[PDB]
Amino acid sequence: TGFHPGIAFTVVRQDRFATEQLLYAERASESYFVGQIQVHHHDAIGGVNFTLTQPRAHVDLGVGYTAVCATAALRCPLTDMGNTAQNLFFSRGGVPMLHDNVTESLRRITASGGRLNPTEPLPIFGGLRPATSAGIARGQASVCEFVAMPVSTDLQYFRTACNPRGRASGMLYMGDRDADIEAIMFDHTQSDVAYTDRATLNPWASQKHSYGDRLYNGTYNLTGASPIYSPCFKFFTPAEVNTNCNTLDRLLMEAKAVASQSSTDTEYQFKRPPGSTEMTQDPCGLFQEAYPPLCSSDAAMLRTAHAGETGADEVHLAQYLIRDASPLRGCLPL
C-alpha cells in the first residue's frame, strides 16, 4: 500500500556482455610436443564406430610474460538488465514458521508479485524449478537482489565504484601475514580500509553473523537448494587461496580466465551446471567493487528540454539522480 516501512535496500544485479577480444603472442612462446596417434574401436548402431586420439604436451617457454589479451569491442549484450527480483522461497531453509497457514499466505502473496516463483506441487527429480514460460523476448533475465540497510546511509557512497557490503574488503589490500586477511573484512573495531572515518556504512550487512552475512555467505549455505543465481555471492563469501602467504602479486594470476559462475542458455540466471566449459572475464569481483548505472528515483529527471540528452541535475528536493560512472558510459542506447 505504498507506506515506506522505515528501511532502505541496495540492489545488486550482474549482467553479461559478449565482447570481441584481441590477443598478442611472442615468437616461439610454446614448446609443443606431439605424440603418436592411436585408434581404438568400439561398437556402433549395428556397425562400428572408430575413434582416433593423440597425446600432446606444452610448456611456457618464457621467463617473464609472453602473451597478452584485451577486450576491444562490444557485440550485443546477452542479458537484459531489467527488473527480475529474486525469491528466497526457492530454498529449503532452516527454522520455519510456526503455523503452516501463514507460510502459505506469505508464499501466495509473494508469488502474486513476481514471475520467478516455484511451482506448487514439489517435483521429485531435480528441485523446485520455476515455471517454464512460453516465449522469451529480450534475452536471459538477470536476477536483481536486495540487501537491507538503514534509510539514511548517505548517497555520496553510491556515486562511484563501491562495495555492497558497505565495507571494502578482500585480499588485494594487505597480504603481509595470514590472519590479517580475516580481520580486514570483519573486525569492526578497526576503521574501514577505504573510508577511515568510520567502521562501516552498513551494520546490518557487514558483520559476522549479521543479517546479510547469515543471508548470503556461502559458508552458512542458506540458498543451497535453489537453482537461482545470486550476485552477492562473490561479494559476501570470503575468498580463500592456498597461496595466501606465498605469492605477493597474484592480481594477474587470479584475474585472467575465471570460469563461469552461472549458465547462459536458460531463460533465467541459474547456477552453473557441473559440465560447462565456459570461460569469462571478471573485473568486478576482482577488486570486489561494483559500478552504478544511470539510475534515478524520479523518472522525470532523466529527460531534458530538447533533442536527446541526459538530465544530470544531481539532486532536487529529496530525490536523487546518480549519473553513471560505469565502464559502459557510451556504447548503450537510450
Binding site: 568400439h42 561398437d43 597425446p55 543451497g224 557441473p274
Partner: protein, 304 residues
Amino acid sequence: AMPFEIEVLLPGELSPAETSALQKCEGKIITFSTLRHRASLVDIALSSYYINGAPPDTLSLLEAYRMRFAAVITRVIPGKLLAHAIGVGTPTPGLFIQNTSPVDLCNGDYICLLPPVFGSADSIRLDSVGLEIVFPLTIPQTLMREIIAKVVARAVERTAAGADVICYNGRRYELETNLQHRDGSDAAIRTLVLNLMFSINEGCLLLLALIPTLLVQGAHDGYVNLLIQTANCVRETGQLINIPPMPRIQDGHRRFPIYETISSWISTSSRLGDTLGTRAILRVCVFDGPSTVHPGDRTAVIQV
C-alpha cells in the same frame, strides 16, 4: 557383442603418489548419474552426490545408489581409467571385483552394495584437484537385509521423542549411522508403513484366528517352539487378544479369500528388501580360485 566400456579422463594435475593409490583401487565399484561413453573425474567423486549443498548421508546415499548406474574399474592406465557397466544388459567375458566389505564372502552369494556404515572409510582424497571418492561396500545379501532392518528401525525410533551391533559367523560389528535431513528419513517410513498396509486383506482374519492353535502345535515340535520365542508379537497376542469367530465367507462358493491374501503378500515381500535397500546386482562365482573371499582379495563375478 562387446561390453559397454567407460573411459574417464584423469586431469593432468595428479602427483605420482596419488596415482599410486589409484592403481590399487581396481576391482572397486563406481557409479555414474548418466551412462555416456566419456565422463570426467568430477562426475564420480563425492561432490556429485551432494543432496543440496551438504554431503549426503545413509538414508540418502542408499537412495542414490539405487538411482544410479553402477560400473566396475578394470585397469588404470596412465592418464585414463577404463571401466565396464554392470546392470545395463551387456555381457562381460571376464569380470573381477575386490572385496571391500569387512566380512568374508562365500561362494554363490548374491551381492548388494551399501554405503560406508561401519564407520571406517578407505576413501582416496585427491587433494590436488581437491576431490574425494568413496567406494560402496560390497556386502552379501543376508547381511544387507539385517543392516537395512537395523537402519530403518533406528530411523523410526530416532524421530519419536526426546531428541548397534550385528553378529555374523560369530563376530560382532558395531555399525553407526548419521540420520541427518529429517525429511529424507520420512520418505522411507512412508514406504515402510505403505508396504505394511497393502499386505492386509480379508484373509488375514483366519491366519489370526489360529494363532492360539499355533501355540499348541508349537508346544510339541522344536522348530515351531523357536518361531514362538519368548519375545514376539504373535506370542503375546495369543495370551491377551482374542479373535471373534469367523463370519461365513461371503461369496465363498467361487472366490477363495485366503488364496488372494497369501498371493498378495508374495508381491510386497519380494519388494520390501528391494525398495528399502538395494537390489542384488552381482553373484560371486569363483571358478577355481580359493572358495572364500577375505577383505581385500579379488574374485570373479557374473551379472545377476
